[PDB]
Amino acid sequence: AAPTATVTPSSGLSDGTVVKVAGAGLQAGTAYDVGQCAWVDTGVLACNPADFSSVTADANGSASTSLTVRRSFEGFLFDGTRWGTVDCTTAACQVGLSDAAGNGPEGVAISFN
Ligand SMILES: COc1cc(C)c2ccc(O)c(C(=O)O[C@H]3[C@H](O)C=C[C@@H]3O)c2c1
């Protein structure tokens, strides 16, 4: 019941744009791994190398974590293989945290409003 973890701005397509990501109704007192994950390869769900940033939302599911949106970088497929891309300007990169359950409910496709 909220926008969850989302970057302040919208045009995430900014040379490693540093902003704050507020997570409303997110990990209600829980914690996860914040990062921009998305299909990097041919529909292959690959996370960025900077998508590794522990996160924790207050009991009020308030995960106000700040990080940089490094659209450019070496992506890695979730399957097990690594891609790279270098520039995640093609596939919308979703900035969010991952659950320890094996799901990707959180993640805002940042890049362009
Ligand atoms: C699908 O979208 C995202 C979004 C964010 C923020 C993500 C943040 C970190 C990630 O490592 C992933 C990811 O690996 O997605 C997999 C994972 O095993 C759980 C469900 C998916 O199958 C991810 C996927």
Side-chain angles (χ1 to χ4, degrees):
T4 88
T6 34
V7 204
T8 255
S10 259
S11 51
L13 85 98
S14 235
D15 277 81
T17 235
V18 210
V19 272
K20 312 165 261 143
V21 173
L26 219 191
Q27 283 334 80
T30 354
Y32 278 160
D33 286 328
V34 129
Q36 335 123 124
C37 203
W39 331 90
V40 100
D41 228 340
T42 286
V44 186
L45 197 92
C47 311
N48 281 212
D51 132 278
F52 328 139
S53 174
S54 51
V55 94
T56 247
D58 328 347
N60 208 355
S62 335
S64 306
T65 188
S66 107
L67 226 83
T68 298
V69 66
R70 301 259 161 81
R71 182 226 323 155
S72 38
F73 252 140
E74 189 193 88
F76 107 88
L77 310 337
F78 88 93
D79 173 55
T81 302
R82 69 219 102 203
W83 176 255
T85 274
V86 199
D87 224 45
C88 170
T89 183
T90 286
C93 344
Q94 295 144 0
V95 197
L97 28 291
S98 112
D99 342 297
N103 332 122
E106 252 53 274
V108 53
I110 216 61
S111 29
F112 169 49
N113 191 356

